[PDB]
Design an enzyme around this catalytic site. Structure first.
Site, PDB file in Angstrom:
ATOM      1  N   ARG A 117      -9.599   7.982   6.265  1.00 62.60           N
ATOM      2  CA  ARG A 117     -10.690   6.624   5.308  1.00 62.60           C
ATOM      3  C   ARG A 117     -10.515   7.714   3.724  1.00 62.60           C
ATOM      4  NH1 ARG A 117     -14.063   3.506   7.565  1.00 62.60           N
ATOM      5  NH2 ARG A 117     -12.428   1.958   8.388  1.00 62.60           N
ATOM      6  N   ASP A 132       1.123  -0.799   0.138  1.00 59.32           N
ATOM      7  CA  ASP A 132       0.349   0.324   0.286  1.00 59.32           C
ATOM      8  C   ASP A 132       1.156   1.253   0.044  1.00 59.32           C
ATOM      9  OD1 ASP A 132      -2.114  -1.225  -0.148  1.00 59.32           O
ATOM     10  OD2 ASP A 132      -2.477  -1.571   2.011  1.00 59.32           O
ATOM     11  N   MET A 189       2.241   3.966   8.997  1.00 58.22           N
ATOM     12  CA  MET A 189       1.368   4.147   8.612  1.00 58.22           C
ATOM     13  C   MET A 189       1.790   5.773   8.672  1.00 58.22           C
ATOM     14  SD  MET A 189      -2.429   3.351   7.178  1.00 58.22           S
ATOM     15  CE  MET A 189      -2.233   1.679   7.503  1.00 58.22           C
ATOM     16  N   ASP A 198       0.738   4.131   1.889  1.00 56.67           N
ATOM     17  CA  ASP A 198       1.006   4.641   3.766  1.00 56.67           C
ATOM     18  C   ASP A 198       2.235   3.549   4.323  1.00 56.67           C
ATOM     19  OD1 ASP A 198      -0.436   2.887   3.778  1.00 56.67           O
ATOM     20  OD2 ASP A 198      -1.695   4.494   3.932  1.00 56.67           O
ATOM     21  N   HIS A 218      -3.439   9.205   8.401  1.00 56.26           N
ATOM     22  CA  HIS A 218      -4.728   9.690   7.355  1.00 56.26           C
ATOM     23  C   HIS A 218      -6.209   9.139   7.337  1.00 56.26           C
ATOM     24  CE1 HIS A 218      -5.246   5.431   5.456  1.00 56.26           C
ATOM     25  NE2 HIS A 218      -4.427   5.234   5.886  1.00 56.26           N
ATOM     26  N   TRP A 267     -13.627  -0.726   1.244  1.00 57.43           N
ATOM     27  CA  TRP A 267     -12.992  -0.947   2.956  1.00 57.43           C
ATOM     28  C   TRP A 267     -12.886  -2.561   3.005  1.00 57.43           C
ATOM     29  CZ3 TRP A 267     -12.549  -1.916   7.112  1.00 57.43           C
ATOM     30  CH2 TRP A 267     -11.737  -2.237   8.201  1.00 57.43           C
ATOM     31  N   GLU A 303     -10.903  -7.504   1.414  1.00 59.99           N
ATOM     32  CA  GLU A 303     -10.093  -8.618   0.420  1.00 59.99           C
ATOM     33  C   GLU A 303      -8.235  -9.406   1.273  1.00 59.99           C
ATOM     34  OE1 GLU A 303      -7.905  -5.485   1.528  1.00 59.99           O
ATOM     35  OE2 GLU A 303      -9.316  -5.095   1.195  1.00 59.99           O
ATOM     36  N   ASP A 304      -7.752  -8.818   2.181  1.00 59.84           N
ATOM     37  CA  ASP A 304      -6.625  -8.733   2.633  1.00 59.84           C
ATOM     38  C   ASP A 304      -7.118 -10.707   3.686  1.00 59.84           C
ATOM     39  OD1 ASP A 304      -7.599  -7.368   3.760  1.00 59.84           O
ATOM     40  OD2 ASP A 304      -6.724  -6.522   5.903  1.00 59.84           O
TER      41      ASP A 304
HETATM   42  O1  UPG Z   1      -8.689   6.453  -2.682  1.00 65.14           O
HETATM   43  C1  UPG Z   1      -7.889   5.550  -2.204  1.00 65.14           C
HETATM   44  C2  UPG Z   1      -8.055   4.805  -1.308  1.00 65.14           C
HETATM   45  C3  UPG Z   1      -7.161   3.227  -1.367  1.00 65.14           C
HETATM   46  N1  UPG Z   1      -5.939   3.552  -1.359  1.00 65.14           N
HETATM   47  C4  UPG Z   1      -4.517   2.672  -1.575  1.00 65.14           C
HETATM   48  O2  UPG Z   1      -5.460   1.282  -0.991  1.00 65.14           O
HETATM   49  C5  UPG Z   1      -4.716   1.159   0.038  1.00 65.14           C
HETATM   50  C6  UPG Z   1      -5.150   0.745   1.601  1.00 65.14           C
HETATM   51  O3  UPG Z   1      -6.644   1.614   1.657  1.00 65.14           O
HETATM   52  P1  UPG Z   1      -6.237   2.528   3.331  1.00 65.14           P
HETATM   53  O4  UPG Z   1      -7.632   3.568   3.523  1.00 65.14           O
HETATM   54  O5  UPG Z   1      -5.339   2.985   3.183  1.00 65.14           O
HETATM   55  O6  UPG Z   1      -6.197   1.223   4.164  1.00 65.14           O
HETATM   56  P2  UPG Z   1      -5.347   1.098   5.661  1.00 65.14           P
HETATM   57  O7  UPG Z   1      -7.436   0.663   6.203  1.00 65.14           O
HETATM   58  O8  UPG Z   1      -5.271   2.507   6.369  1.00 65.14           O
HETATM   59  O9  UPG Z   1      -4.244  -0.352   5.693  1.00 65.14           O
HETATM   60  C7  UPG Z   1      -4.987  -1.672   6.166  1.00 65.14           C
HETATM   61  O10 UPG Z   1      -6.468  -2.201   6.490  1.00 65.14           O
HETATM   62  C8  UPG Z   1      -7.059  -2.325   5.152  1.00 65.14           C
HETATM   63  C9  UPG Z   1      -7.852  -3.438   6.098  1.00 65.14           C
HETATM   64  O11 UPG Z   1      -7.646  -4.252   6.404  1.00 65.14           O
HETATM   65  C10 UPG Z   1      -6.361  -3.369   4.095  1.00 65.14           C
HETATM   66  O12 UPG Z   1      -6.295  -4.276   3.424  1.00 65.14           O
HETATM   67  C11 UPG Z   1      -4.953  -2.334   3.667  1.00 65.14           C
HETATM   68  O13 UPG Z   1      -3.932  -3.477   3.184  1.00 65.14           O
HETATM   69  C12 UPG Z   1      -4.182  -2.813   5.593  1.00 65.14           C
HETATM   70  O14 UPG Z   1      -2.762  -1.606   5.178  1.00 65.14           O
HETATM   71  C13 UPG Z   1      -3.760   2.438   0.099  1.00 65.14           C
HETATM   72  O15 UPG Z   1      -2.407   2.647   1.732  1.00 65.14           O
HETATM   73  C14 UPG Z   1      -3.690   3.035  -1.057  1.00 65.14           C
HETATM   74  O16 UPG Z   1      -2.502   1.983  -1.552  1.00 65.14           O
HETATM   75  C15 UPG Z   1      -5.570   4.842  -2.628  1.00 65.14           C
HETATM   76  O17 UPG Z   1      -4.506   5.090  -2.994  1.00 65.14           O
HETATM   77  N2  UPG Z   1      -6.402   5.419  -2.869  1.00 65.14           N
HETATM   78 MN    MN Z   2      -3.828   3.475   5.120  1.00 64.76          MN
END
Ligand code: UPG
Ligand code: MN
Ligand code: UDP
Ligand code: CA
Lengths: 272, 123
Positions: free
Chosen positions: A219, A122, A214, A124, A217, A184, A187-188
Site C-alpha cells: 500500500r 487499475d 495483480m 496492476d 505490491h 484507500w 469508493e468501489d
Molecule cells: O499511490 C498510488 C495509489 C494508487 N494508485 C492507483 O490506484 C489503484 C488502486 O490502489 P491499490 O493500492 O493498488 O489498490 P488495491 O488495494 O490493491 O486494489 C483493489 O482494492 C481497492 C479497494 O477495494 C480498489 O478500489 C482497487 O480498485 C482494487 O483493484 C492502483 O492500482 C493504481 O491504478 C496509484 O496509481 N498510485
Molecule cells: Mn493494487
C-alpha cells in the site's frame, strides 16, 4: 468495412502472466506497430462497434504501467477494440483519489474521440484470459473477477474494484463516480451502490475466464485506508445526487502523448 | 499474517453466537475490517487499530504511545499483532459486551445481507 465478429477469431484463451523479466517500452512499441501516437488503435480489418477508452487512475506506478502496457496492448488488439489508453496522473502529494481520477479520465478521453464505452482499470491488473473482453455489456461489467490476490475468487458478490466497464450512458446514469473518497477503500463499494440505486445489476465473466493477476505490491504512502469509507458507503443513495460528474472540478496541468498511451497530469484538489 | 476465510473461521469458533453474531457475519466483518491480516495496523484519528479485529488503542489495549488508555482489555496492543487469536478474541468479546457490534463499522453497511457467501466451504 464489415463489422468485427461478436467473438474475435484472434483469441488465444488462457495466457502466461509473470512480472520477473524486465520490459522495455521501446521493445513494446516495437512489438505493437499498429498502436498510434497516444496509444490509439483501430482495427483496419473490420469495424468494431466498441469505441473504448481505457482509463487508468495513476500516481508513481510507472513500473506497473510498463507491465500493463506490455500485456494489454496485444490483448486489446486481439479483441478488435477501437481503443484509447488514458493514464490520469494525480498531480501533487495530498491523499490519493482513485474515483475522482476515473471521473477525469471520462471527461478528458471524451475530448479526444466520441467513445461510447469506458473501461476503468487499475495499473496492476492483468487479465489471464483474452476471452475476458474489455468492452461494455447490457449491464455494468465487472472485469477483474478472479484475482490471484484473492485465490482466484470473487472476494464478495458486492465487489466492484479493479477493472470494470460502463457504457457512456450507464456511467452518466449514476452521475458518474464519486469525488469525495480520499484514501484507500470504499469508493468501489460506493460505485457498486450507485448501480443498484439506479436499477442496474452487475455483469461478469465466469471465474475461469475471469482469472486475473495483480502485481504484488505494498500500500502506497498517501493512500492510507479511508477511516470514513464505511460511513460514506451507507449514504450513497443521497450523496450520489450531489457528488459526481456534476460536481467535478479539476485543472489540467499537462497532456502528454507517448506512442503507447496518453498521460494527463491533473490537479484535483484536496480532501475537504 | 494474511489468513483466509476458513482459517479465520476455525480460529474464531469460540466467539460464534456471542452477543448474537454468527460466524458468517464475523467472516464478513473481518474481511472488510483487516482483510484477514493478523498484523494489520491502521491509523484513524490519532489512534491505532490492531490485528484481525482492528482493536483500538484509544480505549481497549495498551500501546507504548498511549500509556493513558483505559486498556479495558488489559493487554498490550502488540499482543494483537501475533498469530495467537485467543487474546484478540477475548478482547473482541469485551467490546461486544460493552459497546456492541457497532464498534465494527463495516458491519451495518457490508454485512447486513448476503451472508451465505461468507461461510467456509471446506471441512
Ligand atoms: O499511490 C498510488 C495509489 C494508487 N494508485 C492507483 O490506484 C489503484 C488502486 O490502489 P491499490 O493500492 O493498488 O489498490 P488495491 O488495494 O490493491 O486494489 C483493489 O482494492 C481497492 C479497494 O477495494 C480498489 O478500489 C482497487 O480498485 C482494487 O483493484 C492502483 O492500482 C493504481 O491504478 C496509484 O496509481 N498510485
Ligand atoms: Mn493494487
Ligand atoms: O510509449 C512510450 C512511453 C514511454 N516511453 C519512455 O518512458 C518514459 C516516461 O517516463 P514517465 O511517465 O515517468 O515521464 P514523466 O511523466 O515523469 O516525464 C519516457 O521518457 C520514455 O523514455 C517510451 O519509450 N515509449
Ligand atoms: Ca494475539
Amino acid at each position: 468495412l464489415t463489422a468485427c465478429p461478436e467473438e474475435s477469431p484472434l483469441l488465444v484463451g488462457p495466457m502466461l502472466i509473470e512480472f520477473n523479466i524486465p520490459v522495455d517500452l521501446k521493445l513494446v512499441e516495437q512489438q505493437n506497430p499498429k498502436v498510434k501516437l497516444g496509444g490509439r488503435y483501430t482495427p483496419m480489418d473490420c469495424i468494431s462497434p466498441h469505441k473504448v477508452a481505457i482509463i487508468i487512475p495513476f500516481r508513481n506506478r510507472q513500473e506497473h504501467l510498463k507491465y500493463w502496457l506490455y500485456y494489454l496492448h496485444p490483448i486489446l488488439q486481439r479483441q478488435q477494440l477501437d481503443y484509447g489508453i488514458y493514464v490520469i496522473n494525480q498531480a501533487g502529494e495530498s491523499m490519493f483519489n482513485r474515483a475522482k481520477l476515473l471521473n477525469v479520465g471520462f471527461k478528458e478521453a471524451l475530448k479526444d474521440y466520441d467513445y461510447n464505452c469506458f473501461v476503468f482499470s487499475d495499473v496492476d491488473l492483468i487479465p489471464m484470459n483474452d476471452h475476458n473482453t474489455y468492452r461494455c455489456f447490457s449491464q455494468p461489467r465487472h472485469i477483474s473477477v478472479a484475482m490471484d490476490k484473492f485465490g482466484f475468487s470473487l472476494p464478495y458478490v458486492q465487489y466492484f474494484g479493479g477493472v470494470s466497464a460502463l457504457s457512456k450512458q450507464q456511467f452518466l446514469s449514476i452521475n458518474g463516480f464519486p469525488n469525495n473518497y480520499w484514501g484507500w477503500g470504499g469508493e468501489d463499494d460506493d460505485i457498486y451502490n450507485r448501480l443498484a440505486f439506479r436499477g442496474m445489476s452487475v455483469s461478469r465473466p465466469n471465474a475461469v475466464i475471469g482469472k486475473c493477476r495483480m502485481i504484488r505490491h505494498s500500500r502506497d504512502k498517501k493512500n492510507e485506508p479511508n477511516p470514513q469509507r464505511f460511513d460514506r458507503i451507507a449514504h450513497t443513495k443521497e450523496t450520489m445526487l450531489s457528488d459526481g460528474l456534476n460536481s467535478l472540478t479539476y485543472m489540467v496541468l499537462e497532456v502528454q502523448r507517448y506512442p503507447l498511451y496518453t498521460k494527463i497530469t491533473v490537479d484535483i484538489g484536496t480532501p475537504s | 499474517t494474511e489468513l483466509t476465510k476458513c482459517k479465520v473461521s476455525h480460529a474464531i469458533k469460540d466467539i460464534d453466537g456471542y452477543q448474537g453474531i454468527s460466524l458468517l457475519e464475523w467472516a464478513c466483518v473481518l474481511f472488510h475490517t483487516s482483510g484477514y491480516d493478523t498484523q494489520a495496523v491502521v491509523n484513524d484519528n490519532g489512534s491505532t487499530e490492531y490485528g484481525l479485529f482492528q482493536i483500538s488503542d484509544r480505549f481497549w489495549c495498551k500501546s507504548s504511545e498511549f500509556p493513558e488508555s483505559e486498556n479495558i482489555c488489559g493487554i498490550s496492543c502488540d499482543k494483537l499483532l501475533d498469530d495467537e487469536l485467543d487474546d484478540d478474541i477475548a478482547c473482541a468479546k469485551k467490546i461486544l459486551a460493552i459497546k456492541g457490534i457497532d464498534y465494527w463499522k463495516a458491519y451495518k453497511p457490508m454485512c447486513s445481507e448476503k451472508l451465505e457467501q461468507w461461510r467456509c466451504e471446506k471441512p
